[PDB]
Amino acid sequence: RMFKIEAAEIVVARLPLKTHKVVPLLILHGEGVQGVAEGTMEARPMYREETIAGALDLLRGTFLPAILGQTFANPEAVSDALGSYRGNRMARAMVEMAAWDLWARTLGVPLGTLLGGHKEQVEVGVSLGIQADEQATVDLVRRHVEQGYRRIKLKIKPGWDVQPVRATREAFPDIRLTVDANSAYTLADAGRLRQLDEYDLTYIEQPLAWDDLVDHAELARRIRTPLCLDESVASASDARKALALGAGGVINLKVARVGGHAESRRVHDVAQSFGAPVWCGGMLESGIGRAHNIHLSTLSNFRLPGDTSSASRYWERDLIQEPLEAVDGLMPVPQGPGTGVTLDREFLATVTEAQEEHRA
Amino acid sequence: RMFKIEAAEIVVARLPLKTHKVVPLLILHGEGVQGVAEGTMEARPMYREETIAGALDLLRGTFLPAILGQTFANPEAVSDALGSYRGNRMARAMVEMAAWDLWARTLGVPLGTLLGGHKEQVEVGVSLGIQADEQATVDLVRRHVEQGYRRIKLKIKPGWDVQPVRATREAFPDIRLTVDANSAYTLADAGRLRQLDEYDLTYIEQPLAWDDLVDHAELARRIRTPLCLDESVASASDARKALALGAGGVINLKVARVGGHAESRRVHDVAQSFGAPVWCGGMLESGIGRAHNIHLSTLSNFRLPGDTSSASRYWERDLIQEPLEAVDGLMPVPQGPGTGVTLDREFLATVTEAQEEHRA
Numbered sequence: 104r105m106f107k108i109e110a111a112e113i114v115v116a117r118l119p120l121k122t123h124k125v126v127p128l129l130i131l132h133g134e135g136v137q138g139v140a141e142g143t144m145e146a147r148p149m150y151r152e153e154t155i156a157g158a159l160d161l162l163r164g165t166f167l168p169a170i171l172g173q174t175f176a177n178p179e180a181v182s183d184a185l186g187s188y189r190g191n192r193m194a195r196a197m198v199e200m201a202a203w204d205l206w207a208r209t210l211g212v213p214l215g216t217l218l219g220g221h222k223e224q225v226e227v228g229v230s231l232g233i234q235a236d237e238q239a240t241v242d243l244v245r246r247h248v249e250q251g252y253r254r255i256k257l258k259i260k261p262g263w264d265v266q267p268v269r270a271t272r273e274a275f276p277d278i279r280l281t282v283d284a285n286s287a288y289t290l291a292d293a294g295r296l297r298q299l300d301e302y303d304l305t306y307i308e309q310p311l312a313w314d315d316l317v318d319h320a321e322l323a324r325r326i327r328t329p330l331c332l333d334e335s336v337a338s339a340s341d342a343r344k345a346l347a348l349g350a351g352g353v354i355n356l357k358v359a360r361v362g363g364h365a366e367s368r369r370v371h372d373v374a375q376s377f378g379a380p381v382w383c384g385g386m387l388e389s390g391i392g393r394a395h396n397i398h399l400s401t402l403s404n405f406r407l408p409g410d411t412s413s414a415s416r417y418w419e420r421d422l423i424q425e426p427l428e429a430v431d432g433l434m435p436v437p438q439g440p441g442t443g444v445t446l447d448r449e450f451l452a453t454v455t456e457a458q459e460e461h462r463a
Numbered sequence: 464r465m466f467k468i469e470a471a472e473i474v475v476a477r478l479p480l481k482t483h484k485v486v487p488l489l490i491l492h493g494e495g496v497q498g499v500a501e502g503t504m505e506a507r508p509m510y511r512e513e514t515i516a517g518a519l520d521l522l523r524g525t526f527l528p529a530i531l532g533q534t535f536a537n538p539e540a541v542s543d544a545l546g547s548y549r550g551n552r553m554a555r556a557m558v559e560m561a562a563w564d565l566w567a568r569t570l571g572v573p574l575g576t577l578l579g580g581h582k583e584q585v586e587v588g589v590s591l592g593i594q595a596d597e598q599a600t601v602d603l604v605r606r607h608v609e610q611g612y613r614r615i616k617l618k619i620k621p622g623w624d625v626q627p628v629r630a631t632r633e634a635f636p637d638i639r640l641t642v643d644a645n646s647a648y649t650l651a652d653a654g655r656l657r658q659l660d661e662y663d664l665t666y667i668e669q670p671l672a673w674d675d676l677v678d679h680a681e682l683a684r685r686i687r688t689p690l691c692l693d694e695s696v697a698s699a700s701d702a703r704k705a706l707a708l709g710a711g712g713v714i715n716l717k718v719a720r721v722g723g724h725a726e727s728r729r730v731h732d733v734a735q736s737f738g739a740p741v742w743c744g745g746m747l748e749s750g751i752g753r754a755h756n757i758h759l760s761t762l763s764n765f766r767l768p769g770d771t772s773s774a775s776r777y778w779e780r781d782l783i784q785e786p787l788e789a790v791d792g793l794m795p796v797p798q799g800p801g802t803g804v805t806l807d808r809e810f811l812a813t814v815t816e817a818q819e820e821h822r823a
Contacts, residue, residue: 147524147548154520157517161516164507189512
């Protein structure tokens with residue numbers, strides 16, 4: 104039956120990395136259980152347009168007042184209550200995703216299960232930064248291949264693209280190899296990007312403007328390597344437009360970017376209806392966001408590996424009690440209701456910069 | 464020659480409506496003069512995605528530190544110095560537009576002149592809300608026609624659209640008439656919107672999603688009335704994409720929405736290059752924003768009337784010393800350097816709710 108959201112906490116942690124990262128958490132309380140979600144906006148608008156100051160003000164001043172004391176059938180009804188307001192998808196996602204966790208826990212069911220997934224483990228890839236030269240690139244790839252990762256992603260940029268890809272493909276003829284072009288290119292670079300085609304990359308991620316689909320569709324006509332969209336797909340209708348325009352053939356699906364789990368499943372399903380795969384992108388999440396990502400990744404059109412690698416690669420100590428550690432390129436789905444992970448409140452207290460509680 | 468920005472003030476006013484609206488102001492100081500601009504973001508993301516809390520945090524924590532104590536050749540150099548942060552165009556516009564005012568005032572030249580305009584007055588229209596019935600619409604339109612406004616814009620919604628338009632057009636066969644469809648339709652509503660075609664509206668403004676171009680292009684194929692885009696054109700490249708897609712034939716150009724005067728001139732010029740007119744949108748501004756709008760509106764492709772009506776329509780008392788009143792649908796360009804208007808500091812102080820100063 105229905106759930107009443109009785110209280111909310113906003114906790115902002117400064118979590119030591121392996122320099123610190125600010126981790127905004129929302130905790131929703133109702134029906135004797137709690138749901139937790141993690142914001143993926145940054146202090147400044149670098150990856151996309153939202154900021155921690157904007158998002159937290161929107162939460163405390165608008166979204167939480169709208170839902171506190173109210174009773175809902177499901178997370179879709181919670182989202183619907185916020186539909187008047189424009190954009191701010193990652194702020195919306197904090198509420199929506201915490202509501203999924205809460206709802207799932209009222210039923211005692213794993214989150215991925217409720218979303219329709221039935222995988223017990225999910226495939227993971229690795230992301231490599233720019234290295235100094237070809238051999239250093241190949242050495243690091245070799246390490247990660249031996250660790251069992253199921254996809255290799257190389258960061259590239261103008262002046263450093265064909266070289267690391269060529270060297271890697273020569274050393275590893277059969278691996279799943281991709282690149283992240285980081286919106287660093289223009290249509291004038293089509294000829295250079297076309298030189299990647301002979302190395303059979305699975306995709307090139309968002310080479311042109313972060314918010315573009317139209318020019319990506321033109322680029323896709325000029326080169327044979329598939330394009331993968333990231334920042335430019337923030338909704339299921341964006342996904343439809345991207346795929347129908349031919350802007351790309353793959354989507355990097357980040358759950359918070361699109362406004363949460365329900366909209367992410369819609370993106371996933373739109374992509375599947377086009378016979379295009381999605382994969383789970385990463386945003387340097389604490390164990391809360393990482394567990395949400397793992398559960399979403401259990402859906403069947405997550406057919407390429409995700410950025411949900413081991414938590415220990417990022418954090419000295421994570422904010423949850425449960426270790427999220429991949430083995431041989433496979434991350435287990437953490438057991439239990441909802442996300443299947445649990446805040447370590449004593450440790451969280453030691454790294455809390457600010458907290459607040461809200462009621463109706 | 465070059466100008467050094469020595470100080471910045473952020474002043475937020477709570478200005479009584481003729482219940483209130485928040486007016487965020489940025490004042491830049493340098494070379495013995497000052498430039499002033501007005502933010503068009505709201506407390507909550509209703510018209511678009513930015514908020515006052517997000518914008519002001521971006522100003523004080525990022526943009527102002529980037530420019531304070533620095534010397535610049537022109538407003539374009541100021542914009543360049545803000546860096547590659549994504550979105551947040553209205554926050555950027557506060558800085559950019561204040562820099563235009565400051566720069567113009569170091570030269571002693573009217574702002575519109577520097578942007579390339581040479582009109583001494585600009586044509587203006589008005590926008591009317593939904594009224595109780597057909598006769599109430601006609602009566603209200605008559606009042607405004609009898610003031611000489613050069614375009615009447617009617618708000619419409621399902622299913623109050625054909626009725627007010629038909630009644631108005633029958634009473635006024637020769638007036639310039641438009642509608643604001645307020646993102647209240649989807650492609651499912653094409654046949655109903657087509658019924659507006661016989662009434663010779665100049666355009667239907669943003670009938671579909673606030674952030675869409677692709678669906679608008681489909682809708683434009685199905686009805687003969689031109690579409691006008693507002694929320695979905697936030698840059699010159701968006702304007703190019705919109706016009707090349709056939710998403711609209713007219714653009715509502717809001718200076719802050721696109722990131723300020725230089726980008727607005729670019730949008731204006733892109734539109735002109737496609738044979739599409741622009742007109743100057745309004746955001747219920749104080750005299751600061753209104754004066755900026757009037758100056759921009761002097762450019763030659765502002766070929767349809769702007770939402771830039773009299774200040775006394777909105778405020779019992781404005782934040783500037785000078786009147787901004789239109790007569791017979793013509794708004795004079797306020798004389799003087801820069802925007803040609805001057806803060807009434809004594810009055811502003813009585814309605815200030817927040818004030819801060821920043822230096823290098």
